[PDB]
Amino acid sequence: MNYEGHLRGHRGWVTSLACPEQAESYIKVVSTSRDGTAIAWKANADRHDYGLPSHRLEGHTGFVSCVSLAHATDYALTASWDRSIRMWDLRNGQSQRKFLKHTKDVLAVAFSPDDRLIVSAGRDNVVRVWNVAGDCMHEFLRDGHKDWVSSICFSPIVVSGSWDNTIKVWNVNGGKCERTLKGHSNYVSTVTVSPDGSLCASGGKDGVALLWDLSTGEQLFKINVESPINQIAFSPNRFWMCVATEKSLSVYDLESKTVIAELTPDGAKPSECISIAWSADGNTLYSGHKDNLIRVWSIS
Amino acid sequence: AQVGLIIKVLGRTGSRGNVTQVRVRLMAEAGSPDYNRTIVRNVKGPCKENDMLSLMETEREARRL
Amino acid sequence: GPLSKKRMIIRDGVFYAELFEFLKRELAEEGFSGVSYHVTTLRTEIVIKATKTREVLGVNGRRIRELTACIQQRFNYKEGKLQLYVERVEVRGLSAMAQVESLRFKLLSNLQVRRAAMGIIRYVMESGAKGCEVTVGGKIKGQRAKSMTFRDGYMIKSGTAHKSFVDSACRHCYMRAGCIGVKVKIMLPGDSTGRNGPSEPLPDVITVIEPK
Amino acid sequence: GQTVRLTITSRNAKAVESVTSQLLMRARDEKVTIHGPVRLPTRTLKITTRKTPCGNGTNTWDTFELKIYKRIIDLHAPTEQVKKITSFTMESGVDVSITILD
Amino acid sequence: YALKQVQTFGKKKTAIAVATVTKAAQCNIKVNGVPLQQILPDTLRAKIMEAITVVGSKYYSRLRIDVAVHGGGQVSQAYAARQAIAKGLIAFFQKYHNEVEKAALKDKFLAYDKFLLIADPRRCEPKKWGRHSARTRFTKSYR
Amino acid sequence: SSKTPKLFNKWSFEGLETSELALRDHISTTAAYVPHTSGRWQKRRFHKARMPIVERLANGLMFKGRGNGRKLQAARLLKHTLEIIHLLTDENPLQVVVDAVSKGAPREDSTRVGRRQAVDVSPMRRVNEAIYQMCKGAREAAFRNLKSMPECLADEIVNASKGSSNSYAIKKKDEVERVAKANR
Amino acid sequence: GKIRTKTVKRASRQVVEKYYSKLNFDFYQNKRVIMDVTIAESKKLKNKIAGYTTHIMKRLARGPVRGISLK
RNA sequence: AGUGAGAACAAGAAAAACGAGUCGAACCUACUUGAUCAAAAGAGUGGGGAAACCCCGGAAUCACAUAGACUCACUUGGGACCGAGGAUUGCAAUUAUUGGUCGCGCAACGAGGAAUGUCUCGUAGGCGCAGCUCAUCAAACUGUGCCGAUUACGUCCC
RNA sequence: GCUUUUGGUCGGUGGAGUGAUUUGUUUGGUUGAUUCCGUCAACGGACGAGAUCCAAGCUGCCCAGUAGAAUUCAGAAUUGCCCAUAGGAUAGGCAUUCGUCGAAUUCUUCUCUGCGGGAUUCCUUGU
Numbered sequence A: 001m002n003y004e005g006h007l008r009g010h011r012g013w014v015t016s017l018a019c020p021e022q023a024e025s026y027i028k029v030v031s032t033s034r035d036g037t038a039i040a041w042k043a044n045a046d047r048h049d050y051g052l053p054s055h056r057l058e059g060h061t062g063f064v065s066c067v068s069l070a071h072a073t074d075y076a077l078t079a080s081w082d083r084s085i086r087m088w089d090l091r092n093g094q095s096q097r098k099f100l101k102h103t104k105d106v107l108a109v110a111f112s113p114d115d116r117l118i119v120s121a122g123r124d125n126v127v128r129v130w131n132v133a134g135d136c137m138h139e140f141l142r143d144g145h146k147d148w149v150s151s152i153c154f155s156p157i158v159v160s161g162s163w164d165n166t167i168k169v170w171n172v173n174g175g176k177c178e179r180t181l182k183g184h185s186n187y188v189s190t191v192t193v194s195p196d197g198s199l200c201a202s203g204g205k206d207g208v209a210l211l212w213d214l215s216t217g218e219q220l221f222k223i224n225v226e227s228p229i230n231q232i233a234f235s236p237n238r239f240w241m242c243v244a245t246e247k248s249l250s251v252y253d254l255e256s257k258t259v260i261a262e263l264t265p266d267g268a269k270p271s272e273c274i275s276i277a278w279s280a281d282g283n284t285l286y287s288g289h290k291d292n293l294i295r296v297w298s299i300s
Numbered sequence B: 001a002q003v004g005l006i007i008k009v010l011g012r013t014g015s016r017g018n019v020t021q022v023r024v025r026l027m028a029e030a031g032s033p034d035y036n037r038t039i040v041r042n043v044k045g046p047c048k049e050n051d052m053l054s055l056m057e058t059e060r061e062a063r064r065l
Numbered sequence C: 001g002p003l004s005k006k007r008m009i010i011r012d013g014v015f016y017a018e019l020f021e022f023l024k025r026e027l028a029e030e031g032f033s034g035v036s037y038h039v040t041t042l043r044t045e046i047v048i049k050a051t052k053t054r055e056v057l058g059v060n061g062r063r064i065r066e067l068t069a070c071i072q073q074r075f076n077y078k079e080g081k082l083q084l085y086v087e088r089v090e091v092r093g094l095s096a097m098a099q100v101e102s103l104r105f106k107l108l109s110n111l112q113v114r115r116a117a118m119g120i121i122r123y124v125m126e127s128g129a130k131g132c133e134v135t136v137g138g139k140i141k142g143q144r145a146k147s148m149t150f151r152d153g154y155m156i157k158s159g160t161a162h163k164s165f166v167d168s169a170c171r172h173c174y175m176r177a178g179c180i181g182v183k184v185k186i187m188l189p190g191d192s193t194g195r196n197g198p199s200e201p202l203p204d205v206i207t208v209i210e211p212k
Numbered sequence D: 001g002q003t004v005r006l007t008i009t010s011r012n013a014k015a016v017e018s019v020t021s022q023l024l025m026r027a028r029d030e031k032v033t034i035h036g037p038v039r040l041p042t043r044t045l046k047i048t049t050r051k052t053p054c055g056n057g058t059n060t061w062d063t064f065e066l067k068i069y070k071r072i073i074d075l076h077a078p079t080e081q082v083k084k085i086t087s088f089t090m091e092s093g094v095d096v097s098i099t100i101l102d
Numbered sequence E: 001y002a003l004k005q006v007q008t009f010g011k012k013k014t015a016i017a018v019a020t021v022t023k024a025a026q027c028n029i030k031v032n033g034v035p036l037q038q039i040l041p042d043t044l045r046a047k048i049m050e051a052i053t054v055v056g057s058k059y060y061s062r063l064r065i066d067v068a069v070h071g072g073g074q075v076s077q078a079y080a081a082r083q084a085i086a087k088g089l090i091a092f093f094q095k096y097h098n099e100v101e102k103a104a105l106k107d108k109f110l111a112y113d114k115f116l117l118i119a120d121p122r123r124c125e126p127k128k129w130g131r132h133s134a135r136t137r138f139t140k141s142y143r
Numbered sequence F: 001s002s003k004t005p006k007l008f009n010k011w012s013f014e015g016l017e018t019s020e021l022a023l024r025d026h027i028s029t030t031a032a033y034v035p036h037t038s039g040r041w042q043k044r045r046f047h048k049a050r051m052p053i054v055e056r057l058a059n060g061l062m063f064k065g066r067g068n069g070r071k072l073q074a075a076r077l078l079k080h081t082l083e084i085i086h087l088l089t090d091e092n093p094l095q096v097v098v099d100a101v102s103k104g105a106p107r108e109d110s111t112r113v114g115r116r117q118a119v120d121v122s123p124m125r126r127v128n129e130a131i132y133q134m135c136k137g138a139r140e141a142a143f144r145n146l147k148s149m150p151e152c153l154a155d156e157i158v159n160a161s162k163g164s165s166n167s168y169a170i171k172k173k174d175e176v177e178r179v180a181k182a183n184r
Numbered sequence G: 001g002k003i004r005t006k007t008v009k010r011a012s013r014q015v016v017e018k019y020y021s022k023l024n025f026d027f028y029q030n031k032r033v034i035m036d037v038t039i040a041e042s043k044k045l046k047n048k049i050a051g052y053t054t055h056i057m058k059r060l061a062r063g064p065v066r067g068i069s070l071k
Numbered sequence H: 001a002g003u004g005a006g007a008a009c010a011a012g013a014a015a016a017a018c019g020a021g022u023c024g025a026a027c028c029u030a031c032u033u034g035a036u037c038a039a040a041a042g043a044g045u046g047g048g049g050a051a052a053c054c055c056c057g058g059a060a061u062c063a064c065a066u067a068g069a070c071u072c073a074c075u076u077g078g079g080a081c082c083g084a085g086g087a088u089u090g091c092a093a094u095u096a097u098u099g100g101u102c103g104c105g106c107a108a109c110g111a112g113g114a115a116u117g118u119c120u121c122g123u124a125g126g127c128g129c130a131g132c133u134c135a136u137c138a139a140a141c142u143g144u145g146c147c148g149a150u151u152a153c154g155u156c157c158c
Numbered sequence I: 001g002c003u004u005u006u007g008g009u010c011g012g013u014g015g016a017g018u019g020a021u022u023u024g025u026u027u028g029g030u031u032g033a034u035u036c037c038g039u040c041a042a043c044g045g046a047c048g049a050g051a052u053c054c055a056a057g058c059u060g061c062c063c064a065g066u067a068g069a070a071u072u073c074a075g076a077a078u079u080g081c082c083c084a085u086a087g088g089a090u091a092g093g094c095a096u097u098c099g100u101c102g103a104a105u106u107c108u109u110c111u112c113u114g115c116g117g118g119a120u121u122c123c124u125u126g127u
């Protein structure tokens, strides 16, 4: 599809991206990297460089693993390998509070549609929930993961996906685990849920975009990409699936199950995806790369 | 004195290793007789390649190795 | 104030250094193996480690009674302040301080030097030690002195980690012809609780774990 | 409050933390409103002698060091409640000192 | 109705200069209370001024900067101060300004001298026995 | 408002070039507000050619135990040197220095490589030995002289810039080249 | 930053045997595995093991490595 | 001769004695005084068991548009030698213990023959400061900071 | 202390030789390193080297009436017309200064420090 700009501001691999969930949001993507900083971008309006940074969000020491956005607020979260979580104001650019209870790297953070509770997934195998008031409320136990918890997503009941090859589903308010679903046999890199809250796709080292539903616990159609999957994202409208892989970046359909787009750069340096993001409407695609710059793809 | 450019450093020579054997291209003015001429000469001091130096008598060549 | 905290760590070290020398001279044939003293209000503890607890204790505790009040009259303790105990070493083969005092007596009882030293190393290596090294230096054979070392098993020597793993003690043997010095080095095997040996492995052993 | 300051001094770094963190984990159970354990600067003590007992050789030396670890904790409990916090059989080589501030 | 204030630090050998950068009606930069026209050697007043000068005088327009330096002697307190000021401008533009206005003026600092921003990690090397200094040995004589 | 530094707030770096095109990479003409910079120019091999040439004069003054470590002095001592050079020459003094460095060291020399063969001199050493032999010789001039050091240093820089033989360096620059011409 | 000791190289082959599926071409993720699969006390060796493991993962993309015993 | 800016490592008091099982004094120190008149002292009065007092540790190199004296001389360089007061350490100062004051400075020494030692970056060199010896005495040694380069990044010639 | 700031030594069992003794422990590249890769009548081990330990540099958590900081009201000081005897160079909503041995009320930027991150030839393109 269409290719605009190159959008190069980080110094280090862009490990996560997220677009804000509102209209006239004035910032395009919040991209988050291996340099230890996160950057809120803005439109260029001098395009002849698809976008300029608005605010660099500095204050992590180690590698920053994931980013998340509030839905009805300007607030955003970053989770890093310095075993801490910081909450930010994309209006101001400034951190409010540091969430610190992990003893290992914090591989995944997500922020509820109820706009009031934190979730965190780290290498210390424990999924912990906070309030926005800074205090630990509860942490999820009694049947927890045996190895690293890699991803987390709230299903607009938050879902796991991990390194003990299983994907566990639970509510946030009660903490009891609904189902301890498992299909992959090798570790789960990414977990994301459709906007209807009905079905989720999960990738990993197994090389299959092995897909589920949250309704019954049924393995649906799965597709292989024959290469380890970095991140899966869903389009909000025009139901497609974009998958970040070692081999390439390609967009799959659900009913066609075939590449509707195979996204290729200049054609000399591949610069693998490790992070992708769709906008709030679904019109343009943001994909984050090693060899650090961030490619942005607009619809055909 | 003609100004020649070091296109190759052939290794540290002499007993004490202070002299450097280079291969210097003479860099003349391209209509000259002795244009694009390369000489194998001894340089005293720290010399990397692509380092210009002045030459008093360019008709000598040093005995290599 | 009172002495400074810098001045009290000194006098608490010279306390333990002098207490160690007294018991090393007394309890040499009782198989002495160390002291730990615990100080608090109302009482000062002293625990003695030995191999022969029927001998460092008297017939009714007579020997430790005298050995108590020798520490009391020297360091000016009052009645009730100083209490002593005897604990035994659980292994006796991993304590280099006990084995060198026995090897001191194997030579002083006019046994052969090499027969005595291999009797240590057989007893140390059957007691679970990873390695042992006995060095006897002096006038072993005649007028001019020699040095012999006798070895078995592992022995780490160059690290600063050998303070954690290798137990050492050197004594003097007063022969009729001169003076012989004996050394005994024992590399401690195991005992993750710290009974005899460190918890952590050796600094270079990697030991990759097997997957489930 | 009475504001009793306990001084934990020790020569072992692993024994001074195993007292202080144990002493602090006692004084949370009565909700005493402590002021947290501060780490006063560790004082190292150098004696740099010669190695030789004789006179000759290369004039080699060896520096010996001895670090004193030093912690204080301030707690507002009365004077027989702080003896409840203090009374437990510690490791050997750790000195605790009860002091009343003003 | 608000307080815009930023504290930064700089270190050169042992000189730790803490620069409290705050917004005021007038620019007023003074190192330990001396107003930077009065730092006494004209050589070392020019190293503290090129924290301001390589980026422009316009960017320090209404900023009151207070540099409090201790440790490390005469020349090291200039490199500690000029780094505390040059880091002090940028950390005043990490907040309170966008990233486009910064990171041009960060790179104007980095192009000129790398030590306006990072640190010079060099410390004294210890004296050893048998040596008068870190390296110079005692004189051997042979006869 | 980046006002492109002069040198002591007086002498510009705008017009500097080198007559010796052999020595353009090794004489650095980058600008500074003072000679003193306290950077590590000695880690890599050729990095001291990127050091500004007016600093390298200040480093050459810090010799003989009475000067080791006195860089703030040598910056002051060069401040009056460059102003005297302006009064002798009526030119930009920094161009007078770059013209002095370019003429100050011998293009050829003679060492034993095997006999006493004549060997070419690298452009790096020719910048080193020009700075070295001008700080030397101006130091020996003012040793028991009425003249100050900023005059004796200013005289060696001027006479080497003109290529006159009155400079200490140009007496030795010509002695080495004629010995090298006879030891071919 | 020189030759890896046989303590580093023998241990790094054992990580590739027992844990081939958990490892890829990155240092900073392979390091986090080796902290959970190797019980050693030094962080200096665990950095060197994760360097030589990453090297012999690029060698297994090309072809066979001697002494690898992948089975 | 002035004046300014301004470090890090560190040390610090006592016994089963003599005094009021608890407290004093021995140790280092600020501050005042001495002072209607030289230093060096001598005294009060506080504080400190030493991250708590010394201490905002006011080291010395350095710095200075100081509108300061000298001006190339064995000289206001150098301070060896020794004369005369004086005061502290000690049970005792002579073969000056040490400091301070005024003399001496007409004692070589003007950058060092053959030879020779150490060193590759916060380094060499310069600069002082602590501790250690220690009642009194550092041109020592063990440490620490300050100012801060030249050259090489080579070779097997010795 | 010094042989020696060097990378060196030792068994076992197999091979070789009447034997002292060899082999392993090596010709080839490589590293500061018998450090590694390859070869290999050797194969399996032990020590030394590396690792571990201390100190310094960047950093996390914890932390302070034995470390420090900002603020806000009060109190005090300067306050402009001023161009040195001859007087250069050099930043500029609410001016500034602090035994003033002030009150308050929010903080950890620097400080201290027990365990912990970070460096691995990691990435890149010639040998």
Ligand SMILES: NC[C@@H]1O[C@H](O[C@H]2[C@@H](O)[C@H](O[C@@H]3[C@@H](O)[C@H](N)C[C@H](N)[C@H]3O[C@H]3O[C@H](CO)[C@@H](O)[C@H](O)[C@H]3N)O[C@@H]2CO)[C@H](N)[C@@H](O)[C@@H]1O
Binding pocket: I005, I006, I032, I033
């Ligand atoms: N235990 C270290 C030993 O280092 C030795 O090698 C050493 C030598 O090759 C060499 O040491 C030389 C020394 O020979 C020569 N006599 C003096 C020289 N300064 C030393 O240099 C070494 O030490 C100094 C540190 O002060 C550093 O300047 C330099 O980086 C370092 N190469 O560098 C190595 C030290 O890093 C041997 N490989 C070995 O004996 C041993 O491993």
Ligand SMILES: [Mg+2]
Binding pocket: C061, C064, C084, C085
């Ligand atoms: Mg008993």
Ligand SMILES: [Mg+2]
Binding pocket: E138, E139, E140
């Ligand atoms: Mg000597």
Ligand SMILES: [Mg+2]
Binding pocket: H113
């Ligand atoms: Mg003579």
Ligand SMILES: [Mg+2]
Binding pocket: none
């Ligand atoms: Mg045999």
